[PDB]
Amino acid sequence: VKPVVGGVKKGSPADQVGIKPGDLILEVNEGGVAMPGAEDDVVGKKINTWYELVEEVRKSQGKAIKLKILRNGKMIEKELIPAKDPKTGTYFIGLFP
Amino acid sequence: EVQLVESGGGLVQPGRSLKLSCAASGFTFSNYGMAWVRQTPTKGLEWIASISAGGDKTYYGDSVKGRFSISRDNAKTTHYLQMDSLRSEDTATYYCAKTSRVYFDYWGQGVMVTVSSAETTAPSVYPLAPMVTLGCLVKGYFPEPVTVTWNSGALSSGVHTFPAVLQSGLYTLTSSVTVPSSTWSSQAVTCNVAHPASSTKVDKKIVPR
Amino acid sequence: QFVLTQPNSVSTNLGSTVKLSCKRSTGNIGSNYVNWYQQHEGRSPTTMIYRDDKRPDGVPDRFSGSIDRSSNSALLTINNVQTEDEADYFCHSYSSGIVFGGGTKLTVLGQPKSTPTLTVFPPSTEELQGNKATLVCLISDFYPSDVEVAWKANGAPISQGVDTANPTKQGNKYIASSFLRLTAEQWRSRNSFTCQVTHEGNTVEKSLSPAECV
Numbered sequence: 001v002k003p004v005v006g007g008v009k010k011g012s013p014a015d016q017v018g019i020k021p022g023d024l025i026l027e028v029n030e031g032g033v034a035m036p037g038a039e040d041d042v043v044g045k046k047i048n049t050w051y052e053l054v055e056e057v058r059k060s061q062g063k064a065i066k067l068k069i070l071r072n073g074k075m076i077e078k079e080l081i082p083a084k085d086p087k088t089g090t091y092f093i094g095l096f097p
Numbered sequence: 098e099v100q101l102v103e104s105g106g107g108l109v110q111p112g113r114s115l116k117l118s119c120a121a122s123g124f125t126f127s128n129y130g131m132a133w134v135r136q137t138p139t140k141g142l143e144w145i146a147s148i149s150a151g152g153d154k155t156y157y158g159d160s161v162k163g164r165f166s167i168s169r170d171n172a173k174t175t176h177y178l179q180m181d182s183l184r185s186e187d188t189a190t191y192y193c194a195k196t197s198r199v200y201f202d203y204w205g206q207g208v209m210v211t212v213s214s215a216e217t218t219a220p221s222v223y224p225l226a227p228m229v230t231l232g233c234l235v236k237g238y239f240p241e242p243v244t245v246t247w248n249s250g251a252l253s254s255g256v257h258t259f260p261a262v263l264q265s266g267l268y269t270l271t272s273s274v275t276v277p278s279s280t281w282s283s284q285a286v287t288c289n290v291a292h293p294a295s296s297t298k299v300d301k302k303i304v305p306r
Numbered sequence: 307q308f309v310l311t312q313p314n315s316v317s318t319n320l321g322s323t324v325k326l327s328c329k330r331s332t333g334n335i336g337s338n339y340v341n342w343y344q345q346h347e348g349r350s351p352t353t354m355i356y357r358d359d360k361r362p363d364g365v366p367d368r369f370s371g372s373i374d375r376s377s378n379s380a381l382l383t384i385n386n387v388q389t390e391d392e393a394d395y396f397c398h399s400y401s402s403g404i405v406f407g408g409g410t411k412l413t414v415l416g417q418p419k420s421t422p423t424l425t426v427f428p429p430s431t432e433e434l435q436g437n438k439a440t441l442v443c444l445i446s447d448f449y450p451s452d453v454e455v456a457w458k459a460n461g462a463p464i465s466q467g468v469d470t471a472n473p474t475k476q477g478n479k480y481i482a483s484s485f486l487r488l489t490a491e492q493w494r495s496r497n498s499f500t501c502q503v504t505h506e507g508n509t510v511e512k513s514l515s516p517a518e519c520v
Contacts (some may be wrong), residue, residue: 030198033338033398036156037130037147038196063357132404141394144404192350200341200356200398207350225427225442232427236440257446257476259483260348262469269469271442271483273425292405306431 003050004097006071012094013080019095024070031079041061048095050097056084062091099123099203106208107294108217109183110242117178119193119205126174127151130196133167133178134187136207143189147196148176161187180210188212200295211240211294218267219295224288224303225271229281231303232273233288235261238295244287245272252276281305308332310407328380328397328407336373340380341398345409345473345508351396355382383518389417389478399476420479422505422513429493439493441486441514443501445481450506455463455484458500458511 005023008015029044044066045055056065066079082091105117119131146167147156155167169176172193176193190209192199220238224233235243245258252274261270272288280286290299308375318324328340342355353362355371358380358511380397392414397407423446427438445453455470456463467487470485473480484501494516 030304032199033401034198035147035196035200035339035404036402037132037149037154038198039130039154040150041196041198042128042150042196061360108465139389141408142406144406147404199339199400201343201351202353202356202362204350204352214375220430221433223430223433223440225429225430230425231426232442232444234427234430234440234442236433240316257444260471260474261482262471262485264469264487269440269445269485271485273428273444 002051003045003047003053005095007096009092012092013083014078014093014095016076017080020071021026021027025057025067026070026075027055027068028065029066029068031066031081046054057091057093060091065088099228100302101195101205101207101261103191103205103208105283106191106210106286108213108215110212110214111183111185113183114179114181115183117165117191117208117209117210118178119176121174121193122174123194124195127171131169131176132194132196132201133191134194135187135191135210137189140189145191146178173273175184183210183212185212186287200208208293209240209242213240215239219297220290220292222288222290223303224301225273225301225304226303226306228275229278230273230275231281231286232271233271233290233301233303234271235292236269237267238269238292239267240294241268242293243268243270244291244293247274248284248287307401308399308405310399310405312397312407312410313397314408315411315413317413317415318387320387320389320414321393324384324387326384326395326397326410326412327377328382330380330399333401334375335378335380335399337377338399338401339369340373341380342371343382343396343398345394345396347393349401354395369507387414389414390476410434414513417449419506420449421508422446422449422501422503423511424501424510426501426512426514428514428516429488434490434493437471437490439486439488439490441488441493441499441501443484443503443512445482445484445503448473448505449479450507451475451480453506454484455482456502456504457484457486458498458502458513459496460498461500464499 005021060082064081068077100121100122109115130149133145144158148167164182166179190207192207193205195203218239220235223234255275258272261268287300287302311329323417344354345349345351359371370383372381394409396409425444427442451473470484473482498515
């Protein structure tokens with residue numbers, strides 16, 4: 001399959017950030033300020049199978065992440081914090097496909 | 098398996114220069130930045146320099162006022178610290194360390210830089226003969242460090258290399274290994290002494306003299 | 307830009323929980339990641355904790371990290387502390403520069419008393435050819451770490467020419483060494499030298515003699 005954005009839960013992390021539907025998500029990487037000399041270190045993963053996304057959301061462990069994605073063809077990077085759910089306690093962003 | 102093997106240390110006079118090397122392997126070199134960090138007993142850990150994965154961004158710590166420059170040779174999977182205008186206070190053990198965005202994930206074994214106008218002095222090595230315990234004696238060297246192995250590292254368990262004493266400006270230490278007497282009764286046993294600052298390496302077979 | 311302050315030393319007990327603190331002098335601690343490194347005596351550092359609270363694979367799960375923003379401090383917690391945990395621990399963070407704490411030395415009392423093992427070696431013929439003689443006394447497998455080292459010749463205390471190293475930990479226990487600088491003639495003169503070590507009020511000694519049983 002292919003990982004495409006469809007729905008955005010209002011008020012959820014991505015909604016507070018600015019993710020709009022219909023985006024192609026390429027990469028998910030570690031977030032937060034990096035130490036000098038290590039900005040270009042690769043820790044993230046270039047995604048394609050949509051489950052690689054949700055896998056890399058469980059790896060997030062509630063820590064901030066960057067998303068390198070496509071807006072009508074141009075590359076754009078947005079970073080956010082997955083929120084701890086008050087029910088079963090799972091990190092979410094609010095990103096329906 | 099990840100390996101960071103440092104070389105290029107030793108003794109240098111105040112006001113001179115020394116270049117250090119860190120040979121990397123066991124991971125994609127060009128995917129990660131590298132750094133140099135020094136250590137002393139009195140000042141603890143002090144960050145020295147970092148260089149980015151693409152070699153195009155460099156970062157210097159405020160312990161060195163631009164006197165050091167960092168470089169990386171991606172074809173040799175190595176990186177370098179050029180240390181100019183060296184000072185007594187720059188004497189330290191220098192480590193290279195691989196980065197992963199937010200921390201130093203692996204450290205090299207360390208190499209020692211000593212800033213001193215005393216000459217390098219090579220050790221005199223003597224064999225110490227009486228299960229069984231055998232030893233190698235590294236008498237009267239300067240500066241630190243020395244390395245001792247047994248049978249080129251094929252004897253690794255049972256080895257003790259003892260901290261040196263310092264007297265009249267020269268270090269002396271002893272290293273020992275314990276083996277079954279049946280071991281001593283067969284294959285030759287040799288200690289291997291390396292003094293990086295004099296670039297010397299000695300093997301001594303321990304004979305039941 | 308900021309400094310990280312660590313205690314000089316902490317002493318705890320085998321099996322206890324112990325918390326090591328790391329306080330940031332200026333700027334909110336949560337504004338950048340904190341990491342923790344373990345360094346054994348004479349060895350390279352290894353990672354205990356990175357990214358505030360993640361545990362590298364290979365590290366026992368009795369280590370955990372946390373961030374206390376109210377005290378602007380990072381915390382390394384060790385549950386069920388073990389004697390193999392004696393080591394130096396450095397905290398680490400960064401912003402525009404990279405900053406280390408001054409290091410905390412962790413001592414764990416309460417491990418088993420260890421009476422020393424003694425190994426002694428005479429001078430080599432090769433060294434005597436140069437008219438010198440060095441007597442070697444190796445002291446290992448002892449705990450705790452204070453020792454008084456004394457040498458005897460024919461039972462009388464000898465001070466001149468003695469160099470004794472401070473004990474050091476290697477692996478799980480402590481080691482020490484002592485050297486006697488002699489001339490070839492001083493070594494040939496008496497028919498006994500003794501390395502004497504006193505430990506926890508108990509004394510162990512072994513002697514060396516220029517003779518031969520035959």
